[PDB]
Amino acid sequence: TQECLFFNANWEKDRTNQTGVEPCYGDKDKRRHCFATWKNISGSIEIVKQGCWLDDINCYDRTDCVEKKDSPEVYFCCCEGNMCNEKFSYFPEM
Amino acid sequence: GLECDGKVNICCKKQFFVSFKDIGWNDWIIAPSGYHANYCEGECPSTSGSSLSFHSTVINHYRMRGHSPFANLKSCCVPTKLRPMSMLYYDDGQNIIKKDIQNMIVEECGCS
Ligand SMILES: *[C@@H]1O[C@H](CO)[C@@H](O)[C@H](O)[C@H]1NC(C)=O
Ligand SMILES: *[C@@H]1O[C@H](CO)[C@@H](O)[C@H](O)[C@H]1NC(C)=O
């Protein structure tokens, strides 16, 4: 009963699916996550990838998918919860 | 297996963090910036884990029954269980790639 939004901007080159819902599989007693990585050129957001993410503490106890790093070239996002990567936000931690 | 708690130099899993910034890998690794790789350390006196493999179990069964040369072999702290881990890095053609790389984090340490 765990799944994440799947999106691959490189679907053509990789010859894989472009969208869909990816089921998250992980070892017992190990958490599961969703991830989102995009670009933010002057406000126009361009998603790069979205899908399941393996057990990562950095993603623990986060129902919101937020990027807290300061102005990265490629924004990353990870979170806990079904479709938690459905939406993402930017809130740098200073 | 066991986690290292000092004093006792038995085979235990010592925690260890790898910072991609340190080894100069953050230029091609978007996420994460680092991770807990860990390693194994500790002397092994007379397979000394908690949940081994079929092969280690069969040979261990020959060891605990006196059948040599197993009683003439070294025993050393080595990783027994290894965990995969997700990474978002750059391809050789500067393409953003996400993979579930295997044998990334040492979870259990045992004696060979
Ligand atoms: C990929 O897309 C095809 C066509 O929609 C579908 O049949 C298949 O199950 C999908 N696979 C995954 C892993 O999403
Ligand atoms: C980056 O995207 C977020 C929404 O996810 C937005 O709030 C922010 O303004 C964007 N960055 C810039 C520089 O516009």
Residue numbers in the entry:
A (entry chain A): 27 to 120
B (entry chain B): 311 to 356, 361 to 426
The authors write:
Among type II receptors, TGFβR2 and AMHR2 only interact functionally with a select number of GFs, whereas ACVR2A, ACVR2B, and BMPR2 are promiscuous and can form signaling and nonsignaling complexes with an overlapping group of over 30 GFs, including homodimeric and heterodimeric activins, inhibins, bone morphogenetic proteins (BMPs), growth and differentiation factors (GDFs), Nodal, and Lefty. At the most basic level, TGF-β pathways are activated when a dimeric GF forms a signaling complex with both receptor types, triggering a phosphorylation cascade from receptors to R-SMADs that results in R-SMAD–mediated transcriptional responses. Structural and biochemical studies have revealed that the GF-binding domain (GBD) of both type I and type II receptors adopt a similar, “three-finger toxin fold”, where the “fingers” refer to three pairs of antiparallel β-strands that form an extended β-sheet. We have solved the crystal structures of the type II BMPR2 GBD in complex with activin B and of the type II activin Receptor ACVR2A in complex with activin A. We show that BMPR2 and activin type II receptors interact with GFs using a nearly identical mode of binding.
To identify molecular differences in GF recognition, we solved the structure of ACVR2A-GBD in complex with activin A and compared how the two receptors interact with these homologous GFs. For the ACVR2A complex, we used previous crystal structures as search models. The asymmetric unit of the BMPR2 complex comprised three receptor and three GF protomers, where all biological dimers were related by crystallographic symmetry. The asymmetric unit of the ACVR2A complex contained four receptor and four GF protomers, where all biological dimers were related by noncrystallographic symmetry (NCS). One significant difference between the two complexes is the relative orientation of GF protomers within a GF dimer. These differences can be attributed to flexibility of the activin dimer interface, which leads activin A to adopt a closed conformation and activin B an extended conformation. In addition, the different ACVR2A structures were completely superimposable, indicating that the conformational flexibility of the ACVR2A GBD is limited. Thus, BMPR2 has three extended loops linking strands β1–β2, β4–β5, and β5–β6 (blue circles), whereas ACVR2A has one extended loop linking strands β2–β3 (green circle). Notably, the GF-binding spectrum of ACVR2A was more stratified, with activin A, activin B, and GDF11 forming extremely stable complexes. However, the faster dissociation rate of activins A and B from BMPR2 indicated that activin–BMPR2 complexes are less stable than activin ACVR2A complexes, providing a rationale for the preferential utilization of ACVR2A by activins.
